[PDB]
Amino acid sequence: AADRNVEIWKIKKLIKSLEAARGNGTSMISLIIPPKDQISRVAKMLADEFGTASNIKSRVNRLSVLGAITSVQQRLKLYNKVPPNGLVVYCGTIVTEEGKEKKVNIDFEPFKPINTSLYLCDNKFHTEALTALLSDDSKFGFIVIDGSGALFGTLQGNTREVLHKFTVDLPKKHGRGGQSALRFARLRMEKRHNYVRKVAETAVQLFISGDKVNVAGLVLAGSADFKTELSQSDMFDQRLQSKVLKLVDISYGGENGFNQAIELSTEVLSNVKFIQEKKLIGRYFDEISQDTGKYCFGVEDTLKALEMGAVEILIVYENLDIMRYVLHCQGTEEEKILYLTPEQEKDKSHFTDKETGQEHELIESMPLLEWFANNYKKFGATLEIVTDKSQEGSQFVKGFGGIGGILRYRVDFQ
Amino acid sequence: APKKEHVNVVFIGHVDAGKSTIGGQIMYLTGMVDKRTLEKYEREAKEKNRETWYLSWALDTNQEERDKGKTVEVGRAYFETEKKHFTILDAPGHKSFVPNMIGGASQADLAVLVISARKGEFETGFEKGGQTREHAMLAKTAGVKHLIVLINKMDDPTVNWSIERYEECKEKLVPFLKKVGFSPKKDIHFMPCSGLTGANIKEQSDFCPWYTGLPFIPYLDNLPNFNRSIDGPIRLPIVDKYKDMGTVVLGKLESGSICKGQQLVMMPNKHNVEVLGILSDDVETDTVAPGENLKIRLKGIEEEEILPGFILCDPNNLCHSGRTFDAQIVIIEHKSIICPGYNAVLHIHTCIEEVEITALICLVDKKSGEKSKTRPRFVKQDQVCIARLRTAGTICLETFKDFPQMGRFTLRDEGKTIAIGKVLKLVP
RNA sequence: AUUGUAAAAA
RNA sequence: GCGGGGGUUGCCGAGCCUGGUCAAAGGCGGGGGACUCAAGAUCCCCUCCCGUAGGGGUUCCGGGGUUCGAAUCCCCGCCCCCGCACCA
């Protein structure tokens, strides 16, 4: 498993740093050769491509497109056959930081087999296909009922997304102790009646695609009496009624009561499993509510605390410019291992924060999450790579710094 | 020439406390509802097999409310004593309906805390799951300062005007009120009554000799503790919206006086709007002074998407707003860790908006008001601190130092209360 | 008794 | 199920009825080239594995038997296809 943490980190890197690989013209070929195809068929069809790009229009674009078909044509004869995973190749030339130019030539075999085909030349590379390599946990639907309105939305990971929502008016005057029940019934027995209807309408328009639920199931959230009328409806009957994961009694509606419907339905979704990560950021937090001391937070504490014992869970945040550096000492024949961020790192002479100003000479640098991925099993049990999109996620990154741990002993801290 | 004062009275109570039943008496006993009407309420309730709700059906209006014997939407009813005109506010006996309960709390000045003495019904009201907590955090949040504690259901099978249950009620409330909304021990008034038979509402009971104080209708009339009238450039929070005779808008006049035929402007909205008819409390006026619960017919460009929980304001001197702010928070039962990036839903007046804490300022003591000179990672249960806060959208606010009824806030998440908030600096 | 895509007109 | 006939090198198909003169004709396809800007007709070369000197190693479904020697002769196994029939 600890070996797939590293893979996902690599893929995140790869994915981002292939859009940041932009060039100009049609100098940026993406080629995806599927499982066990015909090397000669592809290599030929690229000599048919080089032949038509020997016209192409616009001087430097020709010459660059040619040199980038040439790179693949040469390396594709290295392969004996198309492996079971197919070959993903990305050849072109890119401008990078400082407005400098680099001829980019990538040719690899995906860890998990690619399930798509593509020969396409833009001015940037295509990265949409590599998302399919890590693939899905789901993807839930959420109906939020309230006496002022209703809201259709999804929860995928830790991200609440709002798809659609309408508001309703009801006459909150019926008399003054001498109550008129004709005022009661008249408009309401049609507002309420048309509203359970329209909830079921906007549930069938939004949560059904190609004869099937797009989301994995529905969680239904609402105030009293409006939901036991909607669940057991003939309007909600068939496919939606048989995908009802959990219900939830809530105190409010809208986006307010979209939050409260997840708070209450957390363990019944499950496995989301990013929701269950937010639970476990819950669990870290309510260690820190007590005197029992198996918690650490920040870099400093957390670090020396992993060095002198073991964490059950080591909890790190996905985006994270903090890194493990190893500096030799200015005096020679001694060394320092320090954690820096982009700002400190630019002062290459001290490689430290401006207030300290201490002198150093950097030899190697491993990203702090990458360093952790590669040793969590020698320093503890389990690692969690974590999101910010939930209210527990938000808090971890903002007020702990997206780094802390649930230890296996009583620690003490600064 | 002589004016009777216009203020509302509100009933906050246990879920089963008979908030409707006491309502039904108090109109009948002041003649506001006719004998014919009580006969018809008797009949309609009997014919559908609902005998013990005859009085309750005077306030419980909707089907589910009539069926169960306690409200879900907020109900308003008018009665008149010798010195005053009242609109009385039944606040939901169900707990999923907190938006009807905040609008009921908001129109108060005066809140009547109705506690049932019945075995089972009494004890259950003081648990976390009861409605007494949610009702006291709302009355304090709405400006309430004189609490009337009415011990209901006292002539019943299991209560014989028990002085012991009555003392149990008093004793339990002084710390429960003191803890949930920071109430002091005094400006509290206790009275036993029964709603079903109307005992101690207008006349003295002889089953009860030990209580020789005033009944509820003679008392309420003669209570001096009303602080509603506030002079100043004019402010109305919208508490309810609805169409009847034209489009109508309800709220409390929490600064100054607005005359019929004249402009308002709404806020943050800035929506020009003219009055068409003024019913102050529940009778026609053409002039209306501050502190009165207004029931105004409006004429605007919009009228059915008009949002409750924003203010109307002077057109003329419009009014402070956020959406960024610093504030003092006091952590009663999260009960776990809040650090920065914490979220909740935000109650001030009739507003119920999402909010998040941006950066966390400093720790503050309960005593002396003294802040720490360093800044923390986090805050925990039973502490107090200062935090910066962003709302999802934009709310209009006063500072607590300006007007506390537009400044005192409640950190709501679950069916619980995490902190009580006090807005200090309105940004930008 | 074949085949050849993308930025030119005071 | 009972039978019957088959499975050849990248593919297709000779040749196995003639045991040593089979590392396996031919076709198609692949690879390298000329062809005279570019394809690309046409033609030529190469095309089991391994190796520095036409050497070593392994093949005609899998595995044995018979022979000095079998891809070629005999048997069993797996797999495929086809009749007929109880049952599937």
- Partners of residue A173 in chain B, C-beta under 8 Å: 76, 242, 244, 248
How does strand A323-328 pair with strand A335-340?
Answer: antiparallel
The DSSP line for B132-154 is HHHHHHHHHHTT--SEEEEEES-
The residues with which B371 forms a beta bridge, in sequence order, are B364
* Residues in chain A closer than 8 A to B345 (CB atoms): 252, 256, 259-260
- Proximity of residue A138 CB to strand C below 7 A: no
Nearest to A399 by CA among B155, B356, B269: B356
> Rounded to an integer, what distance in angstroms lies between the CA atom of residue A221 and that of residue A262?
9
Distance from CA of B141 to the nearest CA of A (A): 18
A58 touches strand C (CB under 7 A): yes
* Longest pairwise C-alpha distance within chain B: 70
Cα(A309)–Cα(A292) distance, integer angstroms: 16
How far apart are alpha carbons A210 and B268 in whole angstroms?
44
User: Please, are residues A225 and A235 in contact by the beta-carbon 8 Å criterion?
Assistant: no
Task: Please tell me the distance in Å from A225's CA to the nearest CA on chain B.
Answer: 8
Q: Which amino acid is at B66?
A: R
Is the shortest CB-to-strand distance from A46 to strand C under 7 Å? no
Of the candidate CATH numbers 2.40.30.10, 1.10.540.10, 3.40.50.720, 3.10.20.90, the domain formed by B235-313 belongs to: 2.40.30.10
Q: What is the nearest CA distance from B58 to chain A, expressed in angstroms? A: 5
For chain A, how far is it from start to end, CA to CA, in angstroms? 33
> Which superfamily, per CATH, for B5-222?
P-loop containing nucleotide triphosphate hydrolases (3.40.50.300)
One-letter amino acid at B60 equals D
Cβ separation A255–B354 shorter than 8 A: yes
Q: Note whether B345 and A256 are within 8 A (CB).
A: yes
Between residue 118 and residue 137 of chain A, the positions with Cβ below 7 Å from nucleic chain C are 121
Q: DSSP assignment, residue A2?
A: H
Nucleotide with C1' nearest the A40 CA: D30
Here the tokens at position B398 are 């006063």
Q: How far apart are CA B288 and CA B108, in angstroms?
A: 18
CATH assignment of B324-427, among 3.20.20.70, 2.40.50.140, 2.40.30.10, 1.10.287.130: 2.40.30.10
The number of residues in chain A equals 414
Helix axes B132-141, B98-106, angle to 10 degrees: 40
Nucleotide with minimal C1' distance from the CA of A73 is D31
- The answer to whether A297 and A192 have CB atoms below 8 angstroms apart is no
Please report, for residues B21, B114, B165, B399, the alpha-carbon distance to residue B121 in angstroms, rounded to integers and kept in the order given.
Answer: 16, 12, 12, 40
Whole-number distance in Å between A37 CA and D24 C1': 29
Closest chain A residue by Cα to residue B343? A391
Does at least one atom of strand C sit less than 7 Å from the CB of A24?
yes
Rounded to an integer, what distance in angstroms lies between the CA atom of residue B294 and that of residue B337? 42
What tokens appear for A187 in the block?
Answer: 């408009």
Q: How far is CA A366 from CA A333, A338, A339, in A?
A: 22, 11, 10
Experimental method: cryo-EM
Using DSSP, state whether B336 is helix, strand or coil.
coil
Residue B116, annotated as binding a ligand? no
Q: Give the Cα separation of A327 and B324 in Å (integer).
A: 43
Which nucleotide is closest to A41, CA to C1'?
D30
Chain B residue with Cα closest to A188: B62
| Contact at CB, B241 and A169, closer than 8 angstroms | yes
B56: nearest CA in chain A? A177
Residue spans per domain, chain B: 5-222, 235-313, 324-427
Chain A interface mutation, best of B71, B100, B339, highest count of A Cβ atoms under 10 Å:
B339
Domains B235-313 and B324-427 share a fold: yes
For strand C, the positions having any atom within 7 A of a protein Cβ are 3-7
Q: How far is the CA of A109 from the C1' of D28 (A)?
A: 31
Burial of A11 (0-12, 13-18, 19+ CB in 10 A): middle
Show the tokens assigned to B270.
């800035």
Distance CA(B348)–CA(B422), nearest Å, equals: 10
d(CA A111, CA A10): 11
CA of A38, C1' of D27: distance in angstroms: 21
- Measure Cα distances from B302 to B191, B208, B235, B401 in Å: 47, 56, 20, 33
Nucleotide showing the shortest C1' distance to residue A38 CA: D30
Q: What is the CA radius of gyration of chain B?
A: 22
* CA-wise closest residue to A159 among A279, A245, A274, A267: A274
Q: Number of residue pairs across A and B with CB atoms under 8 Å?
A: 126
The CATH number of A139-171+189-272, from 3.30.565.10, 3.30.70.120, 1.10.3720.10, 3.30.420.60, is 3.30.420.60
Is B20 labelled a binding residue? yes
Architecture of the domain whose range is A18-134: 2-Layer Sandwich (3.30)
Positive/negative CA dihedral, A70, A72, A75, A79 = negative
Rounded to whole angstroms, the Cα distance separating A94 from A125 reads 10
Residues of A in contact with B244 (CB under 8 A): 171, 173
Q: Is the CB of A290 under 7 A from strand C?
A: no
CA B54 to chain centroid, in Å, comes to 25
CA dihedral A37→A41→A43→A49, nearest 10 degrees, is: -120
Q: How many CB atoms lie within 10 A of CB A205?
A: 12
Distance CA A369, CA A367 (A): 6
| Burial (CB count <10 Å: 0-12, 13-18, 19+), residue A368 | buried
State how far the Cα of B150 lies from the Cα of B159, in Å rounded to an integer.
15
Considering only CB atoms, which chain B residues are within 8 Å of A171? Answer: 242-244
- H or E segment and range at residue A149: strand A149-156
Tell me how long chain B is.
Answer: 428
A80 CA to D49 C1', in Å? 14
Domains A139-171+189-272 and A277-407 agree in fold: no
Handedness of CA B285, B286, B287, B292 (dihedral sign): positive
**Is it true that domain A277-407 has CATH number 3.30.420.10?**
no
List chain A domain ranges: 18-134, 139-171+189-272, 277-407
Q: Which two tokens stand for residue B185?
A: 């021990």
